[PDB]
Design a binder for this molecule. Structure first.
Ligand SMILES: *[C@@H]1O[C@H](CO)[C@@H](O)[C@H](O)[C@H]1NC(C)=O
Ligand SMILES: *[C@@H]1O[C@H](CO)[C@@H](O)[C@H](O)[C@H]1NC(C)=O
Ligand SMILES: *[C@@H]1O[C@H](CO)[C@@H](O)[C@H](O)[C@H]1NC(C)=O
Ligand SMILES: [Ca+2]
Ligand SMILES: [Ca+2]
Ligand SMILES: [Ca+2]
Ligand SMILES: [Ca+2]
Ligand SMILES: [Ca+2]
Ligand SMILES: [Ca+2]
Ligand SMILES: [Ca+2]
Ligand SMILES: [Ca+2]
Lengths: 710, 479
């Protein structure tokens, strides 16, 4: 007859609530807390010593759709998950004749609904301490009168099952809004809230994290995961080269629930997952992994993605999933669950590198100088350390340690017509004169596919207006800290483009690199004229450069350049001299010594910025093949000029590979377009067959007007 | 020729990245960077393979290679008597193949020969932050008066009201950092050369010492920046005082001086003064007082490095630490759980010890975060310290040694640091005032005595440096 039920077990057992309890004698179970906050409450305690039946039945009580069963269970008190001797919550509608499980095991493979969840059976090994379980009646098809059982089984003498216990049982009406999932409803009138949560309904609490990451480190206490059921930290069949992962080998419950997170503006959930660890194909009767989300602290769950086992699900795979509108809450938790009817599993599965986050409100800027390694900007960065190096300004992100994987992934940003990319990059700082490059990439599909940012555009191809190699970040030219500024090409435009710096395997530990002062955005103007850095939407001019947009020059720039290559190249004349050195090997190009480009790596010759407003010509001597002749058109040196401090160059001459077999005299009128106040020139060879081959040489350079004559 | 900061110098005069020290690659070419590298034993019950790589015991002996050389899978690795009557075992039993084995569960793991008894958890200092009560098979933490147990976290926090600050010297200024808020302010601007400071919370006074003017000063904090409101306490007979300590109960200042090579005491007004120790002091640095039990503690980094301990009247001097100690130059007390904290600038460590001198614990041993540490402070669950190489103040969890944060940086000379909070300075009775005669009968100084038995003397008198205590034990006799 009665409307509710209630028993704390703290003040003995209570006759009228129960019919009987074979094997449970009031006492103390799983009292421990390593954080010193123990459970001292008394509970029903069905020991593995009591002989015969282990169970507890209630007296018949009247019930409708508002009724909830709320209680604290503890099965086993350890983390060896097992499907042996689970505790079932069954109901009898036939005066205790035959019993049915109160929840069925609903999933796509029954009194079921659309939603997927496990049955009311509680397996051993799911937590250390006491868990709180709550069942609702609204969508069960129950009204009238019924009695309930917590059942474990009939057991012989000498047969030791798992221990279990139960406290704080309540079978009455629900509270106002179900205490928001973070409170123990009492008498249907009173919410007894959970720590951190306040107010009559438990509505008031601190704002949630908007981001989450767990690569899986040895400090696995942290309050990121509400439970890690049947899942262990491991290195077995790692998907990372040699990272640390989470392994689900044991049978029992297999769940993974996050804490409640602020997902109100989240873009993505991403992770690596291998559905089947071994050599052969995992068998087609293995239960799929379901990724779910709760809006209300875990009373009801929606499906994000089902993950089926197959012939091709044998090796690690990167998963990335856009966040649905119906999942963006102030409080939303996600869960990974593998269903099982008996609790036994066939195939084991593994997970690593879980990231949840992103900001879908169309942010168009990402800035950093590396005071902090804000990992909601830099999602991933294996083999990277925050530290100074090579006389970096403050810290850089540095790839220097011994590791078998070196890359760094930005979070997503909106790229448009005015977006540009600017970084400080540096390689080995003279430590090793090896030749290597770092791949700079981009993705518009949350890193499911990475594409090179810049591609080879050479004058052979007539539909190229600017010419440039794909390998921008080479170790000889960027030996010490240098600035790169790229306008962002139209194929990168989107709402959510992310970027990567990748060092492809293999590499030596000694082939190091670093990045500092990253700006990827649409701010400032003119990209600071090439003589600046965008810092918080304002240009920070270079030494000797002023103006709002860094275009007013402070000192006088040289109006003439001249080198006969008698002494090693001066930085008074030359910004960069890569792959070339003084020699007489080339016979006599113009006169005596010449600068000879015969290097294994980059062949680059760039001038300082010059005031060319009243200069007339650029002239030099040139010679090919003092050792080996160039064979392709694409081995021909190009002479370009920049007027934006090296951001975009303009071709002025292709020095064709088939001429200049004998030393020749180049002498060109400067196009009106190059006679600006700050102009530099480069000579570079796009392609060559390595050291000592397809070489060239320059002598008697002179950029100038005609002399006054006396 | 030396190497730059973050390099390691090989024996053949060559510099490599110091992060290539001990990673099993010969980078020097003469194996130098891979000599005397510390070996590896793992966590609690983890198996050490033949090369030192750490795997859980359960992966060992299963046919699969875990260690990079694969040596857990050679034959020098491995080896129901159990359910029936439990077969001699008391609690948790599992049947092994060559013999059975018997282990315990959480809260009681101590076993004589495979029978289990309770863990006494309170035989570890850092089991609870504050109060620890031991039960059978578990334990419970409580809070000292003035502290409330925060139910969301693990920790005993201070009762709500005025929030903790950090006060510290930047050598030419003094700075205050709020802790609940981030309100970062300059408390005194413009000092010449100041490394030592302490505070009297309840009267809101700051005491500091200048090594170049050779004086000890004092001001109220609301007026500390006004040069006129800074009072000179001592202006004679100082060389180089590098440590200060205020006894708030009994109204005395204690200081070290590594120039004169002495330890001294004076009234807060600076009007009456005695040298307490002259002998066996080389480079005395930091000093801290425990006025509730009548003690003072200090450090020195002379050839023989010590943390020493004596009465507040400067009797009963004993050495407290003399092993694994090089350059200890920061010292602080947890008065309630009777625990002392120090930093060592050479050994790069942060350690702790009982007031008695045992239960010694190396909390932090990081050459990255403790390059050249100086000042040290303690409150609730966190330890703070200043570093001179990292130009910063760090925090950390003082129970385990983990959770190392970085509280402020970009600080050129961050020397000494104190927690300004009411609870760091408990109220206590002053016996020189609950006395038959005023000032305990004394003609000059009344110094608190060390309480060794429950009935010790509570105080003792002291005379100027140029005078002797008479036979009445209370008057001063001239020379
Ligand atoms: C998301 O981006 C907007 C700018 O579009 C910004 O105002 C907001 O604070 C951001 N929130 C987070 C959590 O990044
Ligand atoms: C460039 O040269 C001209 C003279 O030909 C001079 O008037 C002008 O100021 C110069 N500007 C710079 C930036 O050197
Ligand atoms: C301490 O040092 C000062 C010199 O700095 C000197 O005048 C004074 O007499 C010394 N006192 C003692 C006790 O050594
Ligand atoms: Ca109870
Ligand atoms: Ca990992
Ligand atoms: Ca920087
Ligand atoms: Ca020449
Ligand atoms: Ca090495
Ligand atoms: Ca193994
Ligand atoms: Ca056996
Ligand atoms: Ca105990």
């Amino acid at each position: 007859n009665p409307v509710l039920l209630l028993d704390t077990f703290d003040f003995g057992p209570r006759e009228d609530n129960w019919f009987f309890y074979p094997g449970g004698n009031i006492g103390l179970y799983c009292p421990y807390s390593s954080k010193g906050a123990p459970e001292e409450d008394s509970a029903m305690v069905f020991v593995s010593n009591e002989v015969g039946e282990h169970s507890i039945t209630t007296r018949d009580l009247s019930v409708n759709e508002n009724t909830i069963i709320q209680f604290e269970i503890n099965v086993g008190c350890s983390t060896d998950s097992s499907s042996a001797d689970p505790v079932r919550l069954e109901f009898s509608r036939d005066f205790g004749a035959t019993w049915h499980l109160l929840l069925p095991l609903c999933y796509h493979s029954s009194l079921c609904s659309t939603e997927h969840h496990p049955s009311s059976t509680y397996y051993a090994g799911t937590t250390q301490g006491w868990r709180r379980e709550v069942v609702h009646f609204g969508k069960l098809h129950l009204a009238g009168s019924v009695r309930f059982r917590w059942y474990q089984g009939f057991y012989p003498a000498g047969s030791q099952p798992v221990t279990w216990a139960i406290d704080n049982v309540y079978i009455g009406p629900q509270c106002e809004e179900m205490c928001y999932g973070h409170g123990s409803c009492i008498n249907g009138t009173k919410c007894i809230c959970d720590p951190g949560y306040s107010g009559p309904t438990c509505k008031i609490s601190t704002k949630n994290p908007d981001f989450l990451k767990d690569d899986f480190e040895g400090q696995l206490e942290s309050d990121r995961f509400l439970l890690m059921s049947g899942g262990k930290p491991s290195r077995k069949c790692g998907i990372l080269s040699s990272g640390n992962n989470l392994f689900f080998n044991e049978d029992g419950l297999r769940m993974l629930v996050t804490r409640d997170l602020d997902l109100s503006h989240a873009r993505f959930v991403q992770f690596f997952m291998r559905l089947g660890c071994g050599k052969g194909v995992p068998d087609p009767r293995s239960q799929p992994v379901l990724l779910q989300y709760s809006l209300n602290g875990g009373l009801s769950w929606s499906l994000l993605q089902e993950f089926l086992f197959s012939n091709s699900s044998n090796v690690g795979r990167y998963i990335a999933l856009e966040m649905p509108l119906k999942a963006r809450s102030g409080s939303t938790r996600l869960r990974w669950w593998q269903p099982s009817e008996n609790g036994h599993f066939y195939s084991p599965w593994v997970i690593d590198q879980i990231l949840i986050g992103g900001n879908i409100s169309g942010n168009t800027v990402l800035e950093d100088d590396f005071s902090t390694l804000d990992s909601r900007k830099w999602l991933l960065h294996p083999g990277g350390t925050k530290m100074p190096v090579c006389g970096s300004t403050g810290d850089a992100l540095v790839f220097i340690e011994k590791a078998s994987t070196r890359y760094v992934v930005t979070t997503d940003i909106a790229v448009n017509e005015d977006s540009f990319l600017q970084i400080d990059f540096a390689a080995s700082c003279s430590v090793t004169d090896s030749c290597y490059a770092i791949e700079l990439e981009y993705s518009v599909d949350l890193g499911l596919s990475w594409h090179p940012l810049v591609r080879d555009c050479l004058p052979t191809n007539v539909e190229c207006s600017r010419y440039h190699l794909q390998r921008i970040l080479v170790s000889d030219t960027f030996n010490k800290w240098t600035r790169i500024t790229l306008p962002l090409p139209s194929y990168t435009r989107s709402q959510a483009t992310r970027f990567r710096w990748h060092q492809p395997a293999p590499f030596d530990k000694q082939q190091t690199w670093a990045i500092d002062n990253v700006y990827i955005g649409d701010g400032c103007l003119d990209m600071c004229s090439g003589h600046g850095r965008c810092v918080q939407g304002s240009c920070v001019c270079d030494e000797q450069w002023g103006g709002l947009y860094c275009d007013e020059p402070e000192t006088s720039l040289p109006t003439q350049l001249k080198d006969n290559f008698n002494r090693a190249p001066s930085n008074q004349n030359w910004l960069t001299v890569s792959g070339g050195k003084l020699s007489t090997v080339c016979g006599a190009v113009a006169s005596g010594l010449a600068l000879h480009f015969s290097g294994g790596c980059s062949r680059l010759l760039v001038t300082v910025d010059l005031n060319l407003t009243n200069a007339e010509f650029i002239q030099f001597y040139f010679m090919y093949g003092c050792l080996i002749t160039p064979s392709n058109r694409n081995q021909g040196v190009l002479l370009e000029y920049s007027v934006n401090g090296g951001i975009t160059w303009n071709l002025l001459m292709e020095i064709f590979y088939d001429q200049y077999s004998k030393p020749g005299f180049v002498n060109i009128l400067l196009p009106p377009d190059a006679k600006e106040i700050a102009t530099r020139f480069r000579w570079w060879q796009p392609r060559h067959d390595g050291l000592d081959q397809n070489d060239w040489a320059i002598d008697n350079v002179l950029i100038s007007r005609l002399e006054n004559l006396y | 020729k030396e190497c730059e900061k973050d390099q390691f110098q090989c024996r053949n005069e060559r510099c490599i990245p110091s992060v290539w020290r001990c990673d099993e690659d010969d980078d020097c070419l003469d194996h130098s960077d891979e000599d005397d590298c510390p070996k590896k034993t793992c966590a609690d019950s983890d198996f050490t393979c033949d090369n030192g790589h750490c795997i859980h015991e359960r992966w060992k002996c299963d046919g699969e290679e875990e260690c990079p050389d694969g040596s857990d899978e050679s034959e020098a690795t491995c080896t129901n008597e159990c359910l029936h009557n439990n077969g001699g075992c008391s609690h948790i039993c599992t049947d092994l193949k060559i013999g059975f084995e018997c282990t315990c569960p959480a809260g009681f793991q101590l076993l004589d020969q495979k029978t289990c008894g309770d863990i006494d958890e309170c035989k570890d200092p850092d089991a609870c932050s504050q109060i620890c009560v031991n039960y059978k098979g578990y334990f419970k933490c409580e809070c000292y008066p003035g502290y409330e147990m925060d139910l969301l976290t693990k920790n005993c926090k201070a009762a709500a009201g005025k929030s903790p600050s950090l006060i510290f010297t930047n050598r030419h200024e003094v700075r205050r950092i709020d802790l609940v808020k981030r309100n970062y302010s300059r408390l005194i601007p413009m000092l010449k050369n100041v490394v030592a400071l302490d505070v009297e919370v309840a009267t809101n006074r700051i005491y500091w010492c200048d090594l170049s003017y050779r004086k000890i000063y004092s001001a109220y904090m609301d007026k500390a920046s006004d040069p006129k409101e800074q009072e000179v306490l001592i202006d004679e007979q100082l060389h180089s005082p590098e440590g200060l300590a205020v006894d708030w109960v009994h109204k005395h200042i204690y200081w070290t001086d590594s120039g004169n090579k002495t330890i001294s005491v004076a009234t807060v007004d600076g009007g009456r003064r005695r040298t307490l120790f002259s002998r066996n002091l080389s480079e005395p640095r930091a000093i801290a007082v425990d006025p509730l039990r009548g003690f003072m503690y200090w450090s020195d980094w002379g050839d023989q490095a010590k943390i020493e301990k004596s009465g507040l009247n400067g009797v009963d001097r004993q050495t407290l630490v003399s092993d694994n100690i090089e350059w200890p130059n920061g010292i602080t007390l947890d008065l309630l759980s009777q625990r002392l904290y120090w930093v060592d600038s050479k050994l790069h460590q942060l350690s702790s010890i009982d007031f008695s001198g045992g239960n010694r614990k190396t909390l932090i041993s990081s050459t990255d975060f403790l390059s050249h540490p100086f000042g040290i402070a303690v409150f609730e669950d966190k330890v703070f310290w200043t570093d001179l190489e990292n130009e910063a103040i760090f925090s950390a969890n003082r129970l385990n040694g983990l959770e190392i944060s970085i509280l402020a940086e970009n600080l050129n000379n961050p020397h000494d640091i104190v927690i300004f909070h009411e609870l760091k300075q408990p109220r206590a009775p002053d016996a020189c005032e609950l006395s038959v005669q005023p000032n305990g009968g004394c003609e000059y100084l009344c110094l608190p005595a060390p309480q060794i038995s429950s009935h010790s003397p509570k105080y003792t008198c002291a005379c100027p440096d140029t005078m002797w205590l008479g036979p009445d034990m209370k008057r001063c006799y001239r020379a």
